[PDB]
PDB file of C-alpha atoms in Angstrom:
ATOM      1  CA  UNK A  44      -0.124   0.292   0.270  1.00 57.41           C
ATOM      2  CA  UNK A  45       1.144   3.819  -0.536  1.00 58.59           C
ATOM      3  CA  UNK A  46       2.411   5.258   2.571  1.00 59.07           C
ATOM      4  CA  UNK A  47       0.448   6.136   5.020  1.00 58.07           C
ATOM      5  CA  UNK A  48       2.140   9.523   4.503  1.00 58.76           C
ATOM      6  CA  UNK A  49       2.388  10.991   1.748  1.00 57.09           C
ATOM      7  CA  UNK A  50       3.973  15.144   1.671  1.00 56.53           C
ATOM      8  CA  UNK A  51       2.794  16.992  -1.361  1.00 58.18           C
ATOM      9  CA  UNK A  52       4.282  20.110  -1.864  1.00 59.98           C
ATOM     10  CA  UNK A  53       5.571  23.380  -0.545  1.00 61.23           C
ATOM     11  CA  UNK A  54       4.095  26.898  -0.563  1.00 61.37           C
ATOM     12  CA  UNK A  55       6.650  29.583   0.769  1.00 59.69           C
ATOM     13  CA  UNK A  56       3.411  31.783   1.182  1.00 59.30           C
ATOM     14  CA  UNK A  57       4.164  35.721   0.678  1.00 60.86           C
ATOM     15  CA  UNK A  58       1.636  37.895  -0.208  1.00 58.54           C
ATOM     16  CA  UNK A  59       4.216  40.070  -2.346  1.00 57.41           C
ATOM     17  CA  UNK A  60       5.805  37.476  -4.158  1.00 58.50           C
ATOM     18  CA  UNK A  61       5.002  38.052  -8.136  1.00 60.94           C
ATOM     19  CA  UNK A  62       4.956  34.559  -8.767  1.00 61.48           C
ATOM     20  CA  UNK A  63       3.911  31.546  -7.000  1.00 63.14           C
ATOM     21  CA  UNK A  64       6.876  30.269  -5.353  1.00 65.86           C
ATOM     22  CA  UNK A  65       5.782  26.438  -4.677  1.00 66.49           C
ATOM     23  CA  UNK A  66       7.425  22.804  -4.609  1.00 68.54           C
ATOM     24  CA  UNK A  67       5.965  19.489  -6.176  1.00 67.08           C
ATOM     25  CA  UNK A  68       7.251  17.002  -3.471  1.00 66.01           C
ATOM     26  CA  UNK A  69       5.637  14.272  -5.200  1.00 66.01           C
ATOM     27  CA  UNK A  70       8.082  14.126  -7.957  1.00 67.61           C
ATOM     28  CA  UNK A  71      11.666  13.531  -8.317  1.00 68.40           C
ATOM     29  CA  UNK A  72      13.284  16.447  -5.090  1.00 67.38           C
ATOM     30  CA  UNK A  73      16.797  16.348  -7.288  1.00 68.83           C
ATOM     31  CA  UNK A  74      15.723  19.022  -9.706  1.00 70.66           C
ATOM     32  CA  UNK A  75      15.450  21.250  -6.581  1.00 69.28           C
ATOM     33  CA  UNK A  76      18.727  20.788  -4.811  1.00 70.20           C
ATOM     34  CA  UNK A  77      19.736  23.120  -8.112  1.00 68.10           C
ATOM     35  CA  UNK A  78      17.014  25.332  -8.013  1.00 66.73           C
ATOM     36  CA  UNK A  79      15.952  28.713  -5.847  1.00 64.55           C
ATOM     37  CA  UNK A  80      13.278  30.682  -4.675  1.00 66.95           C
ATOM     38  CA  UNK A  81      13.796  34.558  -4.521  1.00 66.54           C
ATOM     39  CA  UNK A  82      12.381  36.243  -1.980  1.00 67.40           C
ATOM     40  CA  UNK A  83      12.910  40.268  -0.919  1.00 70.08           C
ATOM     41  CA  UNK A  84      14.706  40.957   2.315  1.00 70.44           C
ATOM     42  CA  UNK A  85      12.545  41.420   5.367  1.00 67.77           C
ATOM     43  CA  UNK A  86       9.040  40.139   3.466  1.00 69.38           C
ATOM     44  CA  UNK A  87       7.105  38.532   5.307  1.00 68.84           C
ATOM     45  CA  UNK A  88       5.841  35.172   4.526  1.00 66.60           C
ATOM     46  CA  UNK A  89       4.562  31.339   5.227  1.00 67.14           C
ATOM     47  CA  UNK A  90       5.994  27.832   4.256  1.00 66.86           C
ATOM     48  CA  UNK A  91       3.105  25.854   4.014  1.00 66.46           C
ATOM     49  CA  UNK A  92       3.164  22.433   3.898  1.00 66.56           C
ATOM     50  CA  UNK A  93       1.320  20.008   1.982  1.00 64.85           C
ATOM     51  CA  UNK A  94      -0.107  16.537   3.071  1.00 64.75           C
ATOM     52  CA  UNK A  95      -2.013  13.582   3.313  1.00 62.22           C
ATOM     53  CA  UNK A  96      -3.305  10.730   5.804  1.00 62.69           C
ATOM     54  CA  UNK A  97      -4.658   7.704   4.178  1.00 62.46           C
ATOM     55  CA  UNK A  98      -5.094   4.794   6.667  1.00 60.65           C
ATOM     56  CA  UNK A  99      -3.683   5.127  10.050  1.00 60.02           C
ATOM     57  CA  UNK A 100      -3.918   8.279  12.554  1.00 59.93           C
ATOM     58  CA  UNK A 101      -0.328   9.718  13.084  1.00 60.18           C
ATOM     59  CA  UNK A 102       0.869  11.412  16.012  1.00 59.77           C
ATOM     60  CA  UNK A 103       3.185  14.553  16.876  1.00 60.21           C
ATOM     61  CA  UNK A 104       3.592  14.975  13.797  1.00 59.37           C
ATOM     62  CA  UNK A 105       6.432  17.231  12.973  1.00 60.28           C
ATOM     63  CA  UNK A 106       8.192  19.722  10.534  1.00 59.22           C
ATOM     64  CA  UNK A 107      11.317  19.874  10.531  1.00 60.08           C
ATOM     65  CA  UNK A 108      13.703  22.641   8.764  1.00 60.88           C
ATOM     66  CA  UNK A 109      17.377  23.579   8.910  1.00 57.36           C
ATOM     67  CA  UNK A 110      18.585  26.682   7.314  1.00 57.64           C
ATOM     68  CA  UNK A 111      22.251  26.763   5.962  1.00 57.22           C
ATOM     69  CA  UNK A 112      24.176  29.627   4.454  1.00 57.80           C
ATOM     70  CA  UNK A 113      28.178  29.337   3.443  1.00 57.98           C
ATOM     71  CA  UNK A 114      27.273  25.494   4.036  1.00 57.63           C
ATOM     72  CA  UNK A 115      26.542  26.301   7.917  1.00 59.39           C
ATOM     73  CA  UNK A 116      23.577  25.926   9.625  1.00 60.04           C
ATOM     74  CA  UNK A 117      22.887  29.473  10.527  1.00 62.10           C
ATOM     75  CA  UNK A 118      19.012  28.326  12.145  1.00 61.90           C
ATOM     76  CA  UNK A 119      17.014  24.958  13.042  1.00 57.79           C
ATOM     77  CA  UNK A 120      13.117  24.984  13.822  1.00 54.33           C
ATOM     78  CA  UNK A 121      10.800  21.733  14.599  1.00 52.14           C
ATOM     79  CA  UNK A 122       6.914  22.898  13.705  1.00 53.36           C
ATOM     80  CA  UNK A 123       4.830  20.770  15.776  1.00 52.93           C
ATOM     81  CA  UNK A 124       2.394  19.926  13.145  1.00 51.95           C
ATOM     82  CA  UNK A 125      -0.127  17.530  15.413  1.00 49.79           C
ATOM     83  CA  UNK A 126      -1.456  14.411  15.653  1.00 52.61           C
ATOM     84  CA  UNK A 127      -3.701  14.051  12.652  1.00 54.16           C
ATOM     85  CA  UNK A 128      -5.854  11.173  11.367  1.00 53.95           C
ATOM     86  CA  UNK A 129      -7.083   9.557   7.831  1.00 54.18           C
ATOM     87  CA  UNK A 130      -8.965  11.691   5.215  1.00 54.07           C
ATOM     88  CA  UNK A 131      -9.494  11.517   2.013  1.00 53.90           C
ATOM     89  CA  UNK A 132      -9.592  15.416   1.099  1.00 54.63           C
ATOM     90  CA  UNK A 133      -5.017  16.594   1.498  1.00 52.81           C
ATOM     91  CA  UNK A 134      -3.494  18.141   4.742  1.00 55.49           C
ATOM     92  CA  UNK A 135      -2.219  22.040   4.922  1.00 55.47           C
ATOM     93  CA  UNK A 136       0.336  23.261   7.307  1.00 55.79           C
ATOM     94  CA  UNK A 137       0.646  26.819   7.897  1.00 55.17           C
ATOM     95  CA  UNK A 138       4.114  27.760  10.186  1.00 56.13           C
ATOM     96  CA  UNK A 139       3.315  31.039  11.738  1.00 55.47           C
ATOM     97  CA  UNK A 140       4.827  34.356  10.293  1.00 54.78           C
ATOM     98  CA  UNK A 141       8.205  34.390   9.126  1.00 54.09           C
ATOM     99  CA  UNK A 142       9.924  38.067   8.116  1.00 53.22           C
ATOM    100  CA  UNK A 143      12.640  36.924   5.933  1.00 56.28           C
ATOM    101  CA  UNK A 144      16.519  38.863   6.788  1.00 56.45           C
ATOM    102  CA  UNK A 145      17.844  42.541   5.304  1.00 55.78           C
ATOM    103  CA  UNK A 146      20.744  44.262   4.893  1.00 55.67           C
ATOM    104  CA  UNK A 147      23.462  44.045   2.476  1.00 56.34           C
ATOM    105  CA  UNK A 148      25.100  41.162   5.053  1.00 57.54           C
ATOM    106  CA  UNK A 149      21.585  38.855   5.288  1.00 57.52           C
ATOM    107  CA  UNK A 150      21.550  38.301   1.101  1.00 54.68           C
ATOM    108  CA  UNK A 151      22.521  35.881  -0.549  1.00 57.52           C
ATOM    109  CA  UNK A 152      21.887  31.886  -1.149  1.00 58.61           C
ATOM    110  CA  UNK A 153      20.023  29.975   1.541  1.00 56.54           C
ATOM    111  CA  UNK A 154      20.071  26.535   1.563  1.00 55.41           C
ATOM    112  CA  UNK A 155      16.955  24.609   3.485  1.00 54.55           C
ATOM    113  CA  UNK A 156      17.177  20.461   4.181  1.00 58.03           C
ATOM    114  CA  UNK A 157      13.672  20.095   5.193  1.00 58.43           C
ATOM    115  CA  UNK A 158      11.698  16.599   6.491  1.00 54.19           C
ATOM    116  CA  UNK A 159       8.509  15.758   7.945  1.00 53.80           C
ATOM    117  CA  UNK A 160       8.064  13.689  10.695  1.00 52.62           C
ATOM    118  CA  UNK A 161       5.870  12.273  13.623  1.00 51.16           C
ATOM    119  CA  UNK A 162       6.721  10.928  16.713  1.00 50.54           C
ATOM    120  CA  UNK A 163       8.003   7.572  16.063  1.00 49.62           C
ATOM    121  CA  UNK A 164      10.792   9.732  14.305  1.00 51.31           C
ATOM    122  CA  UNK A 165       9.428   7.755  10.406  1.00 54.06           C
ATOM    123  CA  UNK A 166      11.045   9.811   7.922  1.00 54.67           C
ATOM    124  CA  UNK A 167       7.650  10.518   5.936  1.00 51.39           C
ATOM    125  CA  UNK A 168       9.972  12.484   3.209  1.00 53.99           C
ATOM    126  CA  UNK A 169      13.141  15.043   3.478  1.00 54.90           C
ATOM    127  CA  UNK A 170      14.202  17.385   0.786  1.00 54.91           C
ATOM    128  CA  UNK A 171      16.285  20.488  -0.330  1.00 54.76           C
ATOM    129  CA  UNK A 172      15.287  23.206  -1.351  1.00 54.27           C
ATOM    130  CA  UNK A 173      16.934  26.520  -1.933  1.00 54.19           C
ATOM    131  CA  UNK A 174      16.332  30.759  -1.498  1.00 56.40           C
ATOM    132  CA  UNK A 175      17.904  34.122  -2.037  1.00 58.03           C
ATOM    133  CA  UNK A 176      17.546  36.535  -0.222  1.00 57.68           C
ATOM    134  CA  UNK A 177      17.638  39.967  -2.592  1.00 53.20           C
ATOM    135  CA  UNK A 178      17.383  44.024  -2.097  1.00 51.88           C
ATOM    136  CA  UNK A 179      14.429  43.421  -4.270  1.00 49.00           C
ATOM    137  CA  UNK A 180      12.718  40.875  -6.480  1.00 49.41           C
ATOM    138  CA  UNK A 181      14.707  42.350  -9.074  1.00 49.65           C
TER     139      UNK A 181
END
């Protein structure tokens, strides 16, 4: 049977972004490693993680995210998702509002290691993507 939990996507929710910033997590995750979303410095945003539970209840689901700059971790955050049972409709998790960095010295590439797990520490899905902070959506 298809995994009990299927992570289906990640969306960088930003009201002022010119276009959609989302990753399809149901396909090939390798392509993301060479790609990067552009985010204007200082803008507020959230991260929407779409997923579905197919058969059994899952408890303590957490969306983990480590952010690196110049190859070194500058932040680690565990987002308590919750315990949710099976449902036909796809679930969506929104992290609290975040604020992007500002100032020259904050600009540049940022790499993210993302993981969706639960209590049993199950690796429901892990993936790496990139971000680039710019003065404007340039």
